[PDB]
């Protein structure tokens, strides 16, 4: 009786029904499932040049593959890029046509993370090669990515450490090109309707079950899996937290940043 | 009455929310017994950078509305990055923490890309607190009384000709304070949300000193909804109230979000 959902637990038109009535003025609105064409895409590291192997990356772009799928998201999966080439490869995902006739996107970044940002491929202390994490909520930004105005933009970041202070976030503070928008975009917010998510806490490893995803990623499918069909996704996120709140050997807390979300995202597993 | 413009919950309203969800709220302390403490830091006179006009309006706002919430609050005006980090790490010790089931820090003041402005604070000999920093003095480690309890930072660092007061980053030796075995084991930073508005200051001038857009709007939201809704989410609907701009676009952040659970405020209660 599973299909498209595999295990995610359903929405039903009954429960549907009353969180919308509830709170629809506050609620994304999601499109019809028939003609919407939803898009995903992960960007996993794995084999780098002159940093350590990240054995457990294939078990985790498959859970978050399948998640995403299930979620009904068309996902496109990126392996081993320099930050260059993930430059490129997230403006292309912005100025995809589909974006016009979704509602919603996730984008996955699993790497390494040091304080500047998401390690690429090529990455050494005297080569940098990092993908700010700045340079993803710009690309996807309402000048940079109209299509998406409006819409939410999940932002999961598997970024761990090792000895390094975590991912850093948060500032405080040439000219563009006139691309000559009707003023409805030159008015809009830049930033807007963005949720991220992000774990920059080490892998433990257990070599009785190597090639295991990582707890982050485990816990988060497991979460998304059971409470897509009744909470929203930040409530989802706080819920994780929640699961992680008595520690075990290896101490997990991640963060939900930069929310410019102005509606609740409720996901409607079925619909 | 003692809440006056925050609308207050009621026990029926109190009692439904408490029902639905007790194991994922904030537990709140008996109202006779509790001492909560908040503080607010806010510079507006500075030697070397601009006046912050309507500053006042924002600090008398925001105390009322604390106090109006239940917290007693000191206020600390014009200080260095060194002074705002004496009073907080003076504010993390504080014994009424011990008998309290939250806080609120508010901070106001200049913001560039390292952090808050300090009175002294000059492109020439910088006087900046770091964000880090203020998480720091507030986190398990340093202040074991506020631990398992929600700890609100509202930041209004206002830009300059500037990119913003940005947050962030994944990823010398202290020293040994020979904490219990328990707080070593524990969580270093949990339980905190901060909001922020980065947004410049625009002045009004044949009405001046007349408060800045963000903090009204925020205490407005906070009068409305404390009675019905997690502070999470009347941060999401100052963000919705914004949403059609005004001339001077607004969109403040809510950042590092370790809440484990809802922290409903239950005026009233
Ligand atoms: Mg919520």
């Given at each position: 009786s599973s299909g498209s959902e595999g295990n995610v637990k359903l929405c039903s038109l009954e429960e549907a029904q009353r969180i919308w009535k509830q709170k629809s003025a506050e609620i994304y609105p999601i499109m019809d499932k028939s003609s919407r064409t939803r898009l995903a895409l992960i960007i996993c590291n794995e084999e780098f040049d002159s940093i350590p192997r990240r054995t457990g990356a294939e078990v985790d772009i498959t859970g978050m593959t399948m998640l995403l799928q299930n979620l009904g998201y068309s996902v496109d999966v990126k392996k081993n890029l320099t930050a260059s080439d993930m430059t490129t490869e997230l403006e292309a995902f912005a100025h995809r046509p589909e974006h016009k006739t979704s509602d919603s996107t996730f984008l996955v970044f699993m790497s390494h993370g040091i304080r500047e940002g998401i390690c690429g491929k090529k990455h050494s202390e005297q080569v940098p090669d990092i993908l700010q994490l700045n340079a993803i909520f710009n690309m996807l930004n309402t000048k940079n990515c109209?299509?998406?105005?409006?819409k939410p933009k999940v932002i999961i970041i598997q970024a761990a450490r090792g000895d390094s202070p975590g991912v850093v976030w948060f500032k405080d503070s040439l000219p563009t090109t006139?691309?000559?928008?009707?003023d409805a975009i030159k008015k809009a917010?830049?930033?807007?309707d963005f949720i991220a998510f992000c774990s920059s806490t080490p892998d433990n490893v257990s070599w009785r079950h190597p090639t295991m995803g990582s707890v982050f990623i485990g816990r988060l499918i497991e979460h998304m899996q059971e409470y897509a069909c009744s909470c929203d996704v930040e409530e989802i996120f706080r819920k994780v937290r929640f699961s992680f709140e008595?520690?075990?050997g290896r101490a997990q807390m991640p963060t939900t940043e930069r929310v410019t979300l102005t509606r609740c995202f409720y996901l409607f597993p079925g619909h």
């Open positions: 109209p299509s998406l105005k409006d006139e691309e000559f928008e009707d917010h830049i930033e807007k008595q520690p075990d």
